[PDB]
Structures are given as structure tokens and as C-alpha cells.
Amino acid sequence: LFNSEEDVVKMSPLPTVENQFTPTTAWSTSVGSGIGNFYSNLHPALADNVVYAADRAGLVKALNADDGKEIWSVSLAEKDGWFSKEPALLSGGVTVSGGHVYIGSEKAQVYALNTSDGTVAWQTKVAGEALSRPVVSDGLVLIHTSNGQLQALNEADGAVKWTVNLDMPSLSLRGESAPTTAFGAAVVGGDNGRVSAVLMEQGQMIWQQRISQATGSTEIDRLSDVDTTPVVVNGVVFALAYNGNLTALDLRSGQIMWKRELGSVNDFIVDGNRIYLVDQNDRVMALTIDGGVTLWTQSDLLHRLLTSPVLYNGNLVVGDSEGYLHWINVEDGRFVAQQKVDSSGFQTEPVAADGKLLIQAKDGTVYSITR
Amino acid sequence: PTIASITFSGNKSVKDDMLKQNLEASGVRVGESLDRTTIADIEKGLEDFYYSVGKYSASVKAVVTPLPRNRVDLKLVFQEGVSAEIQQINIVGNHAFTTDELISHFQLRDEVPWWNVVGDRKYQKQKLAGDLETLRSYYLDRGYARFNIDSTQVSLTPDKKGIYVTVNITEGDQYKLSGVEVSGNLAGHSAEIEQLTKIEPGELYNGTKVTKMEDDIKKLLGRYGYAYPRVQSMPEINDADKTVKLRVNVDAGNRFYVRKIRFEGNDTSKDAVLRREMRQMEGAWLGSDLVDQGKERLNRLGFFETVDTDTQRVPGSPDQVDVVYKVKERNTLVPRGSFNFGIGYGTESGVSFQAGVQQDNWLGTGYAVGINGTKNDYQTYAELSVTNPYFTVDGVSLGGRLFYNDFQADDADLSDYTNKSYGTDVTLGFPINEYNSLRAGLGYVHNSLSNMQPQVAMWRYLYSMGEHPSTSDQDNSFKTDDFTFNYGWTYNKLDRGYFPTDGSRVNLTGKVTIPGSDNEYYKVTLDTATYVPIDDDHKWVVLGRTRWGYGDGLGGKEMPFYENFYAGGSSTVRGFQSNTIGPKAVYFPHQASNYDPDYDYECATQDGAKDLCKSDDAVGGNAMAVASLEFITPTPFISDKYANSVRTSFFWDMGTVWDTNWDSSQYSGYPDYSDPSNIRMSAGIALQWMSPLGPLVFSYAQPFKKYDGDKAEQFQFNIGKTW
Amino acid sequence: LERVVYRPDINQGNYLTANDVSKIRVGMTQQQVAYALGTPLMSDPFGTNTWFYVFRQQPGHEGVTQQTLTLTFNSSGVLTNIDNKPALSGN
Amino acid sequence: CSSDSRYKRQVSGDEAYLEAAPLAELHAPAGMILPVTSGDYAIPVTNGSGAVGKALDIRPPAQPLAL
Amino acid sequence: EVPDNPPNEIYATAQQKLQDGNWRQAITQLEALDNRYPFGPYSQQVQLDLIYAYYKNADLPLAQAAIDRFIRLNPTHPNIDYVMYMRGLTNMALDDSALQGFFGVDRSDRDPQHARAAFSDFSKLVRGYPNSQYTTDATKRLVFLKDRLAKYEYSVAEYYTERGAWVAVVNRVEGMLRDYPDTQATRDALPLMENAYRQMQMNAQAEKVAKIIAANSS
């Protein structure tokens, strides 16, 4: 009847399976019901040979990072009190320093757990929900929110040191980026297509720079650029655009170092010399830090709804929405290897440390990978 | 090139009408100028339009062809990923209520449940722009006077199909209504105004309550003719003590006078037949509720598919209004006005049919005429009625009718006779209250009968009159001549539209003869439908309808069989055959009289027994009770809900008809009709749709309970009733 | 003629409470009278500079009450004559 | 379909307007002023000799036709 | 439905279809000639033909809309007199909803609104284009239609006289004396205001209308 008159703009076939080497799923665990029908950023974290997995129910799950063995764990969901039991809508990734592991939520709460035990150490009702990954700075925590506001919090007990409004458009895509803390400054990006830098105190600025090209009258062409956490090396910042353009920038001023063709991106990483980037067409490509000059570009994961990439074990790797992982060469853009791991949905970003590759798929399960 | 054509491929789930409009809103039109460059502006604008309708993932492709004079056809082809689906709805800073409670009141939804696929979760900013106020009104009703929507936010997934909305809030706190103060140019109405305003100071302050208090103040001033008051509402807020001392401030304006009453529409209705349905008079002070009662009277008359009122201020002068009653006439001006034709076409092989007219567009001094003619069984039944519901302009009414009936009892449950009756009525209606009527009238009837089959339920009456025909025979004659008081009563209030949604209708109609007439039964009938809008808004409705009847002989002379209550008319209870329900007749034996051996005449001892013999004929019964409980629903189609307003309804029909004079001890061998204990139930769906004729109805119903007499057809088409 | 039947409480003309009436004073110009009572719902077709006010009610089949209030002006539209009558009776 | 097959100019309504009322005047006596005859509803003394819609060629006038 | 021959040929077959009274196919062909050649030199001619082609075949609302379109797009043109005349004739005939009443039904008080629109638009015509070939027909229509309006207002004044809304009655009949007093319906209506004034007991006012109507016995 009508089923065939509806349409689905194509999501392209899977590329070359044949590989330089084969990876394997060294271990995996269930974490929750999780990202479910519900897209949000909740990648896990790793430190101290322990994986701080966390999942959207509100469950937090430390795992011994070599094993599908378990470490302290809690649910932060509302104690039901003869009312409607509400899941935390746990969100904004996972971050660890010192005595605490900090995790946002899609409601007012950011929860700090301890690293020593599963108890919530401090919780703070930040200004709108903590979609962004929290980041540490040796005594601060810095956060950004669905309402575009940035918050800075005091790492012992969660009191807000300062707030800043970064403005929002109608039809944002997230109202989310992590702050990045480099050369002593914060850099953050906001869905109006702006990136702003602050002096680590008082909420007072180093600059704003505005990345807002194409300027299409329709909001859907003009979701307004950055959500992706900007990053810095040598005080050279990088920022990038859902539509609009990637750019390298100064940090000391906000001056553009250079600007690049790269829209259709929500996800990237860098290294000591290069940019690696993924796309909403799910093209994947590499550039130099100077000038942002294209090192290589390839497109065989077209519309694969890929994750953010990471540099892992001397290759690139990326997650793929049918549950795959693709390993890609540093300099060639060829596929190095591929695997199927998830079977339920996978666009939440990879995490890599201690030579472990970790992902949390949708359907609330974590997989650990090695090659 | 001129765009000598434009062609559209796909465009699923968006109406072509808004696309056709959006082309013009984008500066492209049929026969406009074009070039291959401009197509890039056209297609992105259509993407922008689809983006603007929530088709955020959409894409457009544009195809251009030269016609032989190099004129161009622009075909347009349309691509989608199923757009604006919503992952989440989220509310932040909230403490007072879990967000499921709030979103349950949104028109938006997060997860359309396995329990119900009705509705959807496609976001639309037009819906959100209302739903934020549904949130705000919920919180103000609960009473959080300092509630603010803080920088409300919408976020859409990096795959452009997904959406979720986050409404940050500060709830503040819920405040009690510790004071109300009302001041201004009240024209002395304070003694009523504050009696709207009465509250216990501990009651909860409430945005809905203050909204209705404002509307009620505008209603009171409407009543007394302050039609366009300024009405202002301001809380004094004690945040420290968390209470509202509410203030309402009113400047009544002038007392408006209705300079003209204007009816626009009415193209068949003489202006008189709308203007007599006014309560509020031109050339008098307005009463807003009086005008609304006029609107309700125009609805109750039913001649109008819509009735709308603009109390337009007069140009060039203050404090005068014209009340424009815009109307749209039902039946679209079709000739012969409201018109009747029917076929009772159902599962039965034979059928009954009907014809007629009634609308007051007729001759002379402008009396109405309405005529009806029918066949059922082998009957002929036909009547003239002549009517003036405003015999004078008080709305005292006249109606007289002259009617002829013949029955030839070839089955159709028609008990075996030849029966004729021809009759007149003259009636005067008094409206004795705004929602009421009374009726008083002469009646006459001449009833003459032949071929009379001896029939207990009939013949018990006949011999309690005397001059019965012979039993053991059928070539049998009887006659009666009658003069009567015909009398009745009504209460009517219906928020009618055309098919009512609210209010009650009750009609009571009865008679008694003049003394010593060839009958002296009294007869009473009552008829009712009460309508209620479910959720108190008129679109979703439940109905309860009842009929009741009695007749018993005054000084003997029980009610004649030829006027008993039939039921099982498809108007009265569906599924049962038009006359079938209640008592079934029992014949006395005869071998035959006036009989054809090639043809069937029941309980002839040459075809049947020689002892008191049932048939599935029904003579109705002398007493009746009927109910329908009925559940009203629309039905979308290419004739969609709004464009055609087709009504359909489930119903629990219930019926019982019986004979309070059944001698259950004497004619005892048979089902006891003295008691209603054979109640009947049928469960049914009926569908009503309207045409240059009138309202057609298709009905389905089969019994829930069915007794031996209960002849039935599981569907029947029918038309009219009109009242 | 008349019978007991629900003649629907017909109002006619204008509202004339005492506190509205006593606003009239012979010095008034029509621009003032028009907000003293509200505008006159009746006026002379035949070209006398005259205004007519009726407060009339008919609370059913029984009872009729009427104030006539006739205002006539100097041709300038400045008032000169006032007449108030509660209605007579007769048929 | 059905049609009267001739005289395609006619009113679909009735011809009657051409006879159904004289322009019957009204003449107030001395001392009275008849109220002002109110603008748009006044109509001229027309030339007269123009045709009447019994016989007028209601066929829409011809523009100059060319390309 | 219709070929895309050269526009002169499509027009020739439109012309012919109208003269044949092939009204339905004619309307479809004029609509196609409009849509396929909306800006060409025939556009005005096509708009006039559309107006007639809606008015005949009694597609009156579409005629009224095509008239609006013509005036909006071409507020100056030698035959705008014909467009306003068609505005008139359309709104006039829009009262005469069917022939079934011919044996006696007085329609004069069914609805004023379209009669009043017809009148005011014929007024614009007769005042603006008195040299038109339509002007006499316009005037005869205006006289009838003005008396028809007066009949509707008189029907309202009758109703209110029978209800006894005597302020309503006087105000209506004074309205008729300001607007279109030179009508038979008003000359018959004035006794009804005399009655209205005298029932309202203002005999010193009523005698003025009594003297007026007595002086209009002749």
C-alpha cells in the first residue's frame, strides 16, 4: 500500500573486508539499557587500568580494563518514593581525575562519583543539562550545556565558580561542546557558530571568533557550525562546523590561521602534526595542523553515520552505525582492517588508552578491542 | 524560458496545496520566467520549505525540458529520510512534577506507545509554539505564578532526521490566592462581579481560574451590554510569603446598542425565519448571552451548517454594534428545500420506501407545506401537513395534517387484515419557556377494516367494543370513527451544529378521545435524546435516547390495535425489522376465507393447525420502553473529517414492547406479553452523510439478544427522519 | 388578543438609570449627551434637531414599562428642551 | 447536461428586473425635511438610449487580437 | 482535454466553443489558454472570456473571482466597464438561486448581501462609465435592485412591527428614508413607521410621518 511510497535516502554499502590484520573483541560487558532510541554523547572513560563505563539509565560501571570483570557501580536514577521512578538520562560522557569521576546528565544534574568508591561524592544542578563531556583542570571542572551556557565548577565539592552565556539559535543541533583547556585558556564552541576563549577565571574572555559561513537563510543549512570540542596544540586551536568550515586559529588572539572546505562534520581528533576528521556524509580525511592542508580524503563510508575517530595503535579507527569498526591508514586513507562488534546501533564515539580501544554501543553495552 | 508547466514527483506526506502556495511564496509560478541557473534557487527554496515543514532530511532534484518553442517544463522530484522524528522531550530545572506528567499534556510526544499508534511524534515548530503555552498554562493552573520558560531550546540530531526539545524552566513556587481585588467602571455590577470572584483565601491561585474569572466578567458585562470592556488582570505578589493578592481592573466601555441585526447567508431562508429566532432585539442594548441564545436558536432550527456571530462595532460611531449572524444553510439551496426520499434497503429481499418534502417555502400567506408518502408491507400511507411555527410572531405555532392509510396484510409481519385509517389533526403550539413548547389540538380518525383475521390481541379489543366479526371466518368487517384531543409537550435545548453535541431534547405526545368516541383510550408517548460532549468540548460526544409509551382504555375501550406502538423501526432500534419487536400475534383457527390456494395466508387449517396459532406478525404493544446509548465518532476519508463532518456512531440499542392487558391466565399457552421481561439488545454502528436530498444513514446492527419474534437484518440503509 | 405565552422579554431603545439621567443638563452639546447616555438610538428623520431615547421593556406576556426621554436642541445642537414621560396606557 | 439551446445572453435569473419597478419618488410636505438621501444609493439621470439586457450583446467585448 | 496548438488557434477554438455554448469544454480551454499563455497579448482577452465563461454555465463564484482578478491585475483597460457590469450581473443573479419559485415565491427578502454588493458595484459602473453601452441596462438594474433592497429592509421592518420592537421599527424605516427613500417599498413602509411611533406613544413625532404619508397619498 503506502509503505513503498515512503522513502529512505540511501546509507551506503560496507567497503572492503580484506585487511592488513584482524582485530578482535578482547572482552565486553553489559552496562545498561542505555542510548536506546535516544541519541546523546555518552562515551566512557579509561584510566588507572580501569574503564569507567556509564550508561543512560544512570548506571555507572567501573570495569577492570583487562577483563569483563567488575569494579564499584551504582544507579543514580530517582529513588521512586511512590512517585514515577525517573532514569537519570545519564549523559555528557565520562571524565576522571584524582578522587572523582564526573558525568553529566540530560537533566540539571552533573554527578561526581568517587574513584575510590561508587558513592556519589557531589552533585550539582547546573544551568540546563550537561550534554557536554566535563573536563578537568587541576581543581576546576568545566562544562557546557544544552542551553549553551558554560559552567565552571570547583573540583572538591561541585560549587560553580562561574557561568558564561554562549548564545543559541533556534534549531540547534546539540547546544553541546566540551571545553578544551590549553596554554592556560578555555576554548569552547556554541551552536550559533561561535568559538570563545576564557582566561580560566571570572568568566572573562580571551576572545570570540565566529565561524558561520554559507549563511543560508534556512536554519537547516544554518544549524550554525560548531558542536565538536575544539582542540589546541602549540596554542594553535582547531574548530569545525556541522556546515560551514573547519578552521585553524590562534589562541592568544582569535585570529583565523586558516579556514577549510570542511562542513558536514560533528566529530574529529588531532595528533602532534595532523588533523583527522569524520563527516555527516561520513567522508573521512586527514590534514596537517599548519594550514589545515589536506593530507588525504576518502569517502567509502558515505552516510555510514560514523563516530568520532581516534588515533589508535598507529592507525585511525572509527565506529560505524551498523555496528562496525573501520581501521584506516595514517597516510593513505586505505582501509587497514574492519570488524563487526555491535548489532543494535553504534554512533557513540570510541575511547582509547593504555592500548585498549573501547566503545559503548547503543543498547547499553561496552566492547573492548585490540589489534 | 517561461515555466509553461511544473510537475511534481513524490511529495508524499505534504499536501500539494501548500506546495503550490510555497512556489509563489518562493517567487516561482506557472508561466513565470526561468533559467537553468534559477533552478538552483528554486530547489533549495523547496528544500527550505520542506525544512520549514519539518522535512529536515529532505532533498529536491529539478528536471528541466525544452518544449518545441523552447518554453520549459520544470519537473521536480522529491527525496526524504523520515524527518523530524523525536528522540526525547526534556524539561530542566523542574522539581515540582516528573516530566512525563507535563509532556502528557503536550501535542508533541517522545515515544508513541505500543498501546496506541494514533497521533505521531513528528516535530513541528507550529505545534511547539503552542505546547510551550500548554506547559505554561499547566504550571499557572497549578499556580506557580513566578514560572518562567528560561531560554527554551530545540536540538536536532547530527543525523538530520532526529529531534529532541529541552525547555529549561524556573518553577518558582506555587502561591495561594490570599486576596482578590476588583475595581473600576463596573456600572454597579460589583454585587454580581464579586460573586464570580468569591474564593477562600487559602485556595490556590490559578492561571486558568483567573482566565475564567476574566471571561466571566466579560460575560456579565456582555449580559448587561458592556460588550467591549477593557478587562485587566494583575497579581500583587508576596514572594516572601508566597501568595498572590490578585487584582482585576475593568473599564466597561459604553453600553453598546444593536443598531442593526444582519443575517448574511440565509439564501433560501426568508430573513423572517432567522430573525424570529433572535432573543436579543435590534434597536436595544446588547446582551451577549442573549445573542448567544439567538445563535443557539439558529442552531436548534437546524437549517444552518454553521452559525457565526460578529458583534462588529459600527464604523463612525462609538457604543453601537451590528450583530452579523453569518450562516451557511444546510442542503445548499437545493430546490423544494429540505426534501425526503427513502428506501429501507437491508438484508430483506423486499423493501419499504418513502418520499416527501418539508420546508416552509410555500404558498399563500406563506404557510409551510410538508408532504409524506410511503409503502411498507403492501401499505399505502400518505399525508399533507400545513404549518406555521409563528402563527404569530410570539412563536405560537399552528400545524394541521390530513392523512390516509391502507394496510394489506401480505406478510411483512403485518397481521392479517385489510385496514384503512384516514385522519386529521389541527394543533396549536405554545412556547411556554425559551427551551419549551406545549401542543394542543383536535384530531379525527376514520378506521375501517375488512378481511379481519380473528386475532386475540386485536379481537379482545374488538369484543370489548362489541359488534365483532365472526370467528371461524376471515371475510370480516369492522369500523370505528373517532374525535380526539391531541396533546403534547416539549423541552428542547441542543447545541446542535446540525447533529447535536450537547443539551437535552424531550418530546411528549399523547391523545384522548372526546367522550363516547368509538375509542376512549388515553395514550402517552415520551421521546428523548440527551447529548453530552465528552471532556466538555463539543467534538467528542456521547448520546442517550429513550422512548416510552402507554395506552389504556378510559371507561373500557382499550387502545385499538391499529394505533399500538410498533418498534423495531431502524430509527428506534437498529437491526430489528421495522415492526417486529415485542408481542407477536396469535390467531384463532379457521380453515380459510377469501383464500388463494396458490398463495400463502398463515394459520389456515388447510395449511396449519386448528387451534390458537401464533404468527411472526406483530401488532406492536400498548406499552413500550426503548433506550439507545450511543458513542459518537468521526471518520476520515477523501471526504475528510473537516470538509464533510460525516457523523458515525456505535450504539447499545435496547427495546421492549408489551401489552398491559394480556390475560396471561386465560390465553395462557403462549409467551406472556404482560411483562417486559423480553427486553431486547442490539449492538450496532450507524453512519450519517448528507446530500441534496438530506441526511442519508447507513446502519449496521445485529442483536445481542434475540427472541423468537425478533426478525432482523444485520444492515439497513435509510434516510431522513428530519426531527 | 393576548395570551399567556413566552414572549421573550423584548428590550427596546436605551438604558436610563437615574444616575445616567441626571447627567443631562441644558448646557450640554450633543457631543456630551452622546457619552451621558450613549448615542441616541432614535433621531428625527424629518430634520428637527431632535434626539429621542426610549428605555422600554416587556418582561413577557404581562407588564410593559417605558420611559420616553425627548431631547430637543437649538439648531447648533446645544440642548434646549427636555421631556421625560413614563408611558401612558390605552388601546 | 441540459440547455435551452438559444439566446446565450439571457440572465439565468429572470428578465423581470427590466419592468419590476418604476423609480417611484417620495415628496415630503412643508415644515418637514426628508432625511438626506445618503450617498451611494442615489443614482444619476442616465442617458436612457442605451440598450437593455433583453437585447444587449453581453458577449464580452473584443480586445484587439494579434501576436 | 485541450491541445497545445498555437495560441491563436486555441483562442479560435475557445471563441468557437463559446459561440457553440460548449460551456464546460470552453471553460477548460480558456483555463488552459490562461495557464499556458498567462502573460501573452491575449491575457486580458482571456480574462474577459473566463469571466463570461464562468458567468454563463452559472459558475457564479468563479466569475466573481475572475472579475476580481481582472480588476486587480488590470485596473485600467477600455472594457473595465464590462468587468464592473459583470461584477454587477454576477452578484445580481447570485440571488436568483433557482427557477422553482416562478409560480409565486417572493425572494426579495431571502438575503441582502449579494443584492447590496451588486447594487454598490453597479453604482460604481453607472457613475464612472455613464457613456458606456451598458449604462441604460445598469440603470434599470439599479432601480430594480434598489427597490429589492428596500423590500428586504421593509420585510425586516414588518417582522419587527409584528414583534413590536418599536425602536427597531422606527430605526429601520428611518434607515430606509436615508438610504433609497425613492422606492415603492419605502412608500409602502411609511405607514408602518407611523404605527410604530404611535404604538410607542410619541404622537407629536408620529403626526409628522402621518402628514408625510397623507401628503403622499397621491
From Swiss-Prot, chain A:
- Extract the CDD domains matched here: PQQ_DH_like
Output the PROSITE patterns linked to this UniProt entry: PROKAR_LIPOPROTEIN
Localization recorded for this chain is: Cell outer membrane
Q: Which cellular components does GO assign to this protein? A: Bam protein complex; cell outer membrane; membrane
Alphabetically, which GO biological process terms does the record hold? Answer: Gram-negative-bacterium-type cell outer membrane assembly; protein insertion into membrane
Q: Name one GO molecular function term.
A: identical protein binding
Entry's Pfam families? PQQ_2
Membrane recorded as keyword: yes
Q: Which PANTHER family match?
A: CELL SURFACE PROTEIN, OUTER MEMBRANE PROTEIN ASSEMBLY FACTOR BAMB
What is known about what this protein does?
A: Part of the outer membrane protein assembly complex (Bam), which is involved in assembly and insertion of beta-barrel proteins into the outer membrane. Nonessential member of the complex, which may orient the flexible periplasmic domain of BamA for interaction with other Bam components, chaperones and nascent outer membrane proteins. Efficient substrate folding and insertion into the outer membrane requires all 5 subunits.
* HAMAP family per record: OM_assembly_BamB
Q: How does it assemble?
A: Part of the Bam complex, which is composed of the outer membrane protein BamA, and four lipoproteins BamB, BamC, BamD and BamE. Monomer. Interacts directly with BamA. The Bam complex has the shape of a hat, with the BamA beta-barrel crown in the outer membrane and the periplasmic brim formed by the BamA POTRA domains and the 4 lipoproteins.
Q: What is the name attached to this protein's record?
A: Outer membrane protein assembly factor BamB
Curated annotation (Swiss-Prot), chain B:
Q: Name one GO cellular component term.
A: cell outer membrane
Q: Per UniProt, what does mutating residue 377 to L do?
A: Very minor growth defect
**Where mainly found?**
membrane
The impact of changing residue 653 to A is: Slow growth on solid and liquid media, less protein accumulates which is more proteinase sensitive
* Substitution effect: residue 348 to L: Very minor growth defect. Lethal
Top-level taxon in the UniProt lineage: Bacteria
Q: What is the effect of changing residue 343 to C?
A: Reduced folding of OmpT
What would changing residue 571 to C do, according to UniProt?
A: No effect. Lethal
Task: Indicate where this protein resides in the cell.
Answer: Cell outer membrane
The free-text domain remark for this protein reads: Contains 5 N-terminal periplasmic polypeptide transport-associated (POTRA) domains which interact with other subunits of the complex, may recruit substrates from the periplasm into the outer membrane and also act as a chaperone. The C-terminal region forms a discontinuous 16-stranded beta-barrel transmembrane region. The central pore is ellipsoid, and probably closed by extracellular loop 6, perhaps with the aid of other loops.
What protein name is recorded for this chain? Outer membrane protein assembly factor BamA
Native source organism of the sequence:
Escherichia coli (strain K12)
Curated annotation (Swiss-Prot), chain C:
Task: Name one process (GO BP) from the record.
Answer: Gram-negative-bacterium-type cell outer membrane assembly
Which superkingdom is the protein from?
Bacteria
Q: What is its main location?
A: membrane
Q: What is the name attached to this protein's record? A: Outer membrane protein assembly factor BamE
Quaternary structure annotation from Swiss-Prot or TrEMBL = Part of the Bam complex, which is composed of the outer membrane protein BamA, and four lipoproteins BamB, BamC, BamD and BamE.
Please give, as recorded in its UniProt entry, the membrane topology of this protein: Lipid-anchor
State the UniProt keywords alphabetically: Cell outer membrane, Lipoprotein, Membrane, Palmitate, Signal
Q: Name one GO cellular component term.
A: Bam protein complex
GO MF term (any one): protein-macromolecule adaptor activity
Report the sequence similarity comment from the record.
Belongs to the BamE family.
Where is this chain's protein located in or outside the cell?
A: Cell outer membrane
Biological function: Part of the outer membrane protein assembly complex, which is involved in assembly and insertion of beta-barrel proteins into the outer membrane.
Give the residues of the full protein shown: 23 to 113 of 113
Q: Which residues form a coiled coil?
A: none
Natural source organism: Escherichia coli O6:H1 (strain CFT073 / ATCC 700928 / UPEC)
Curated annotation (Swiss-Prot), chain E:
BP terms from Gene Ontology: Gram-negative-bacterium-type cell outer membrane assembly; protein insertion into membrane
Record bears the keyword Lipoprotein: yes
GO CC term (a single one): Bam protein complex
The keyword Lipoprotein is assigned to this record:
yes
Which regions form coiled coils?
Answer: none
- What SUPFAM superfamilies does the record tag this protein with? TPR-like (SSF48452)
Compartments (UniProt record): Cell outer membrane
Q: What highest taxon heads this organism's lineage?
A: Bacteria
Q: Which InterPro entries match?
A: BamD (IPR017689), BamD-like (IPR039565), TPR-like_helical_dom_sf (IPR011990)
Pfam families associated with the record: YfiO
Keywords of the record: Cell outer membrane, Lipoprotein, Membrane, Palmitate, Signal
Q: Which PROSITE patterns match?
A: PROKAR_LIPOPROTEIN
Q: How is the protein disposed in the membrane?
A: Lipid-anchor
Q: Please state which protein family the record places this protein in.
A: Belongs to the BamD family.
HAMAP family recorded: OM_assembly_BamD
Functional note: Part of the outer membrane protein assembly complex, which is involved in assembly and insertion of beta-barrel proteins into the outer membrane. Constitutes, with BamA, the core component of the assembly machinery.
Self-association state and partner proteins as the record states: Part of the Bam complex, which is composed of the outer membrane protein BamA, and four lipoproteins BamB, BamC, BamD and BamE.
Name of the protein described by the UniProt record: Outer membrane protein assembly factor BamD
